[PDB]
Write a protein that binds this ligand. Structure first.
Ligand code: HEM
Ligand code: HEM
Lengths: 458, 458
């Protein structure tokens, strides 16, 4: 019941009073983000709460965040919180722990270099043209457009060609065997898990694998079909080939190959589609920002020139818009590390087993570091003001050795979509648009209502 | 079902074919020991089997046993197999893992030194006189005596005075609050656990603590009564004081104090009582050995002189009888270590998670190292033949940093009992005696029938 619920009281750490068994999970009715901002406002820099029987310690001090994410990563704070039923996804880089994660991290790090990203921008740019082609149709209909569907179709077209080389227009091909099996996904079982963590091993013995054995065998058989058709018949630049070439520490196995590719699919579809919808909402509700970005894009790229890797990294106002949107909407919301052993960081005793949490959403809106946090102001990230941003308060991609390994890929992917879309269209709020935007009440950072806007042709 | 049952087939390791879910647990119908000897005879030096879904690898090569128990103890083979419902006994030295065990081992190692054992032999010898006093009564009745009851009463009298200083004659005091609460213990739930390991965390949330909350609070309140009555009112030589003094790495906590004392109670009652019964069986069925031991005891100790610490370690034939009995009856039966990470020891790939097992019982009776293993021959351990015994085939107390920390205490305790008993009595087989002795069919090394013998007065 209250087995470990007296931990934070024994250490003198404040926090909301936990209920037996449940802990503080009932305080999630307002959302992960609202619960973090209220605890930050009512407890100061450090507080604690319980996800069931699991004690969670939240820290907001910049030096402690640097100590947890960077200084004591390999020694104390290496792994993340486990785990609903895992299956074979234990070999996933974002799920692996300790030395197995370090092996996968070092094996997949050369894949996400800027040199390998630069070789992927011709393929990613191809579907930017496909994106505006499906947007040209939905704009000429003369009625609001749900940005979740055109960005989700674009985000999948990028992740299928970059991870496997499969080149399909998803929006106009409702069912290419590959598209549908990738669409087979995916509350309130997640809160049941956090309050019944002892029932997780039972879902392993009942062979209740979280992923359908049909799609799993598909991707596993689709990959082995690709590995066999390419060895040898008879130069490719996808994530699969970059991992196949690395197989010739110890090399990755064939099942480990499937595990990482499933990660990138989950990593690209949810995030890039949601962040692009957040950006277009801010661009539509701030037409002055949208015009200045279009004026910059027209300058570096004359007469709608095709965006390239070097021309994307030259646009400063584009990078300022992406960073300011990621401040208001950090899709990860939280950063988490498990304390492997008893440690003393910056004057605090952190006992073993406690989950250290970085409230990234609450830090991005804390009035102590941000002037008028609720407003979309891209000028915070200009070269004049960029210096005075603490890189441990603003952590949209995390920090330390276990930060987002696909940060460069995600930034390049979203910018290539924003450029081609803004070169052809302008976006204004319609009457179905939710103004102001409300966040989802669930456990995902997504708009409560799908973003609908007007789309004109330039 | 057969999730990891194909592990030993992938590594080319022989072993009995496992059944789905059950594995090889049905082969335990003949006993842990018979199953190890059959697998040793039918597979050679190395084989594998499954306790449910848990793969177990047995090794019999001396160099590999030394590598697992000594060379790669801290690095690879540090912890033992876990764990039915634990409760607060996670702080037990024999259950603790990794650095927490090393902390408890170094904190309790100075307690089991020969200097501290030498200061305990006057108190242990007091109950040797109590042992012969209760044996003088049960011998004058002129009928067979169950050695389990007089040795169990003696073994408890030693463990209560050495661990807490409580001085009570257990046999004639049926219920001293302390005696009974120590007698509140304790199949087929153990095999249910090995086949349902996922149900162990459920016994933790149901507050089904394996130890009754009544006796547990008793010992916890009995210890705090002793710690408070001794601090200060107002020189003691028990295990509790040796651990109380060590509290003034990091010092042991009050709950950690109770955990280790519970270990010593379980460690002393079952073993010393059972081994003494095994010794007296061999002494009775080999009267030539019993006479030569009594002739040696009468030499060093004239006219039944009181045995002392120095006089015990002088008796060679007494040490030869104890060692030969521990060969035929190693009460631990098996030595186990968990492989923490992928390692390559002496030409073998040991994957992570595999339990490495040392069949101590089967090694002590292997005809390759022992001539006529089934016969009780103390001359194997004479100074002439003692050199040619491999210390990794004969491992009655284990080996390496995690061997039996109470080996010296157990050897001194049993010898002090054997001396005082053999100084006064002789032992012959009666008609109720099970000849030849059969081992228990269960999961404990104890006689199938309780050892009953004739007891005469000298
Ligand atoms: C807007 C897009 C994205 C954002 C904002 C984002 C953000 C994050 C954050 C905050 C973390 C956790 C960092 C930490 O715990 O310190 C993370 C982890 C990770 N991300 Fe991303 N991510 C994005 C897209 C992607 C993409 C497209 C990929 C791959 C194709 C990717 C791959 C990963 C991986 C593998 C990890 C775990 C790294 C590890 O455990 O070593 N992410 N991401
Ligand atoms: C005839 C009596 C005894 C025998 C044959 C015996 C044998 C053993 C064996 C074989 C092990 C495992 C070694 C390994 O895994 O390598 C062990 C462990 C242990 N024994 Fe004994 N034992 C006896 C009595 C005792 C007594 C009386 C005590 C304490 C009062 C004791 C305390 C321990 C402890 C604490 C461990 C675990 C050590 C650790 O995990 O670090 N034993 N014993």
């Amino acid at each position: 019941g209250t087995h470990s619920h007296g931990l934070f009281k024994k250490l003198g750490i404040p926090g909301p009073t936990p209920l037996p068994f449940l802990g503080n999970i009932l305080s999630y009715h307002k959302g992960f983000c609202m619960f973090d901002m209220e605890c930050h406002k009512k407890y100061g820099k450090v507080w604690g709460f319980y996800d069931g029987q699991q004690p969670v310690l939240a820290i907001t001090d910049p030096d402690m965040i640097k100590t947890v994410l960077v200084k004591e990563c390999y020694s104390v704070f290496t792994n993340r919180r486990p785990f609903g039923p895992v299956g074979f996804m234990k070999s996933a880089i974002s799920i692996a722990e300790d030395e197995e994660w370090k092996r996968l991290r070092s094996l997949l790090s050369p894949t996400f270099t800027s040199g390998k990203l630069k070789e992927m921008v011709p393929i990613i740019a191809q579907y930017g043209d496909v994106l505006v082609r499906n947007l040209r149709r939905e704009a000429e209909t003369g009625k609001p457009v749900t940005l979740k569907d055109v960005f989700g179709a674009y985000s999948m077209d990028v992740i299928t060609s970059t991870s496997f080389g499969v080149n399909i227009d998803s929006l106009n091909n409702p069912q290419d065997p590959f598209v549908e099996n990738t669409k087979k996904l995916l509350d309130p079982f997640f809160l049941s898990i956090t309050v019944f963590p002892f029932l997780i091993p039972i879902l392993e013995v009942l062979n209740i694998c979280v992923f359908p054995r049909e799609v799993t065998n598909f991707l596993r058989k689709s990959v082995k079909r690709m590995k066999e058709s390419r060895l040898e018949d008879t130069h490719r630049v996808d994530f699969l080939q970059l991992m196949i070439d690395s197989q010739n520490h110890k090399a990755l196995s064939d099942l480990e190959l499937v595990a990482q590719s499933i990660i990138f699919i989950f990593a690209g579809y949810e995030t890039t589609s949601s962040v692009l919808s957040f950006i277009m909402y801010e661009l539509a509700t701030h037409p002055d920002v949208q015009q200045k970005l279009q004026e910059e894009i027209d300058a570096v790229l004359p007469n709608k020139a095709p965006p390239t890797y070097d021309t994307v990294l030259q646009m400063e106002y584009l990078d300022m818009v992406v960073n300011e949107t990621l401040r208001l909407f950090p899709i990860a919301m939280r950063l988490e590390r498990v304390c492997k052993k008893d440690v003393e960081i910056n004057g605090m005793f952190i006992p073993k087993g406690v989950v250290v949490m970085i409230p990234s959403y609450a830090l991005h809106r804390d009035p102590k570091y941000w002037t008028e946090p609720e407003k979309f102001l891209p000028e915070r990230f200009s070269k004049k003001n960029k210096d005075n941003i603490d890189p441990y308060i603003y952590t949209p991609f995390g920090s330390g050795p276990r930060n987002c390994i696909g940060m460069r890929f995600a930034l390049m992917n979203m910018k290539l979509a924003l450029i081609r879309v803004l070169q052809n269209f302008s976006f204004k709020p319609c009457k179905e648009t939710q103004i102001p935007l409300k966040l989802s009440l669930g456990g995902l950072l997504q708009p409560e209502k799908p973003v609908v806007l007007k789309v004109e042709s330039r």
